[model samples]
Target: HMRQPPLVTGISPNEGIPWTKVTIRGENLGTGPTDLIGLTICGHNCLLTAEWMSASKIVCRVGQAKNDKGDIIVTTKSGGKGTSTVSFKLLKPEK
Candidate 1:
C-alpha cells in the first residue's frame, strides 16, 4: 500500500563543511535501513552515508557542494521523494 511521503521538519548542525554529520528529523521516512533508498543534501548524493535511525529521524553525512544552501531530500521505498522545508548551508573550511 502507498503511504505519505517523508517529511523533513528540521536538521541539526545545519551548516558546515563537506562530510559534516547531520541529523534530519521528520516523519514517514522509513521503518528500517532498507526502507531508505536515496538521500541527498545540498544537491549532492549522500546516500552512502545515510543511516536510517527511524521513521522520524535519519543521520547522514554531506558531500561536496558548491551551492551555499540547498534542500535535504529523503527518498524511501514507500514515500518516494520528499524535500525538507528547511535548507542546509555549506561553509568553507579554514585554510
Candidate 2:
C-alpha cells in the first residue's frame, strides 16, 4: 500500500499566462505517478488540463475562461482508491 503524504507547501507564480506554460512545485512527492486537472467552478467557465512531468513538478497549459476567472486544481493519481487532499491554485493569468 502507498502512503498519502500531507501537503506541506506549493510553488506557483504570483500570476500565470493564459494558454501558456506554467509550472507547479510541491514537496513530499515520491516516485508515484501524478496527474494534473482543473475545473472552473469559481467562474463556471471551462475545463483546464496539464501534463505532469514528475511527482513534484508539472507543466500545465491555461484554459479558456469566461473572463480570466477560474480555479486550477491538481491531483495525484495512484491506486483507484485514495488521493491527495493537498492542491495548488493556478491564480489569475498575467500579461
Candidate 3:
C-alpha cells in the first residue's frame, strides 16, 4: 500500500501567547529515523523537539508572533505536507 501524506485535523487552544506549547493533531505522520517534520506558527518556524508524540500528534512551542493571526503548516519528511484550515491567534502575554 502507498503511504499518505500528513493531514492536520485540529490544534488546541488556537490562541495563546508566544512561547506557549501547542499540540498539532493529524494523521499519517511518519515514525522513522529520517522522518523529520517541520512546523510553522504565524509564518515562523517553531521548535520541533523530541516531543513529537505520534503519527497523529506533535508538540511544539509557539514562536514570537509575526502578526495577530496566521496559519499553521506542518511539513513531513519526504515532502508530505499539511496545513491548518484556520488561522491561529496570537495574543500578548500578561507581564
Candidate 4:
C-alpha cells in the first residue's frame, strides 16, 4: 500500500493582487477528475474557481485576503493534504 499526500512544487505568477489567476504545479495532486476535493490560495477558498487540469496541474483564481502572503493548500480524495513548499505572496495596487 503506497499512500502519500500531495506536494506543491511551484506556482506561476506566484505573487499578484487578489483575483489573479495562478497556475499550480505539483505532485500527487489527485487521482481523477473528481478526485480533487479542495483548493485554497492565499488562504482563501478557491475550490469553485479551481480547475483540475491534471494530476500535477491546477489552474485557479484567488480572492481577497487579509494577509499579504499565504500558502497554497491542495486536498485530494486519495492523497488528502499535501506538503506545500512555497507560499503565494500578494501584490497591492498603489493608492
Candidate lDDT (C-alpha), each: 0.78, 0.42, 0.67, 0.77
TM accuracy, model 1: 0.86
**Model 4 TM-score relative to the real fold:** 0.84
Which order, best to worst by TM-score?
1, 4, 3, 2
- Runs of candidate 1 exceeding 4 Å displacement: 66-68
> RMSD of model 1, in Å?
1.9
| Of 1 and 3, the candidate ranking higher by lDDT | 1
Q: Tens digits of per-residue lDDT for model 1 on 4-75?
A: 888887777767877677788888888879978887877789898887778888878776784555777788
Estimate, for each residue in 4-88, the C-alpha lDDT of model 4 and write its tens digit: 8888878777667767778888888896868887777766787888888888888887666755547678888887876677877
Off by over 4 Å in 2: 5-8, 28-49, 64-71, 79-95
User: What TM-score, computed on C-alpha atoms, does each candidate reach?
Assistant: 0.86, 0.43, 0.73, 0.84
**lDDT per residue, candidate 3, 1-95, as tens digits?**
67677777677887778677778777765564256556666767774552566777777776777755566566778656565566657778879
lDDT of 2 by residue, 1-95 (tens): 56564232444554444554556455533344333333232233233354545666655554554434344443334322212343333455564
Best by lDDT: 1
Clashes of 4: 0
Decreasing lDDT order of the candidates: 1, 4, 3, 2
Candidate 2 weakest ten by summed lDDT:
79-88
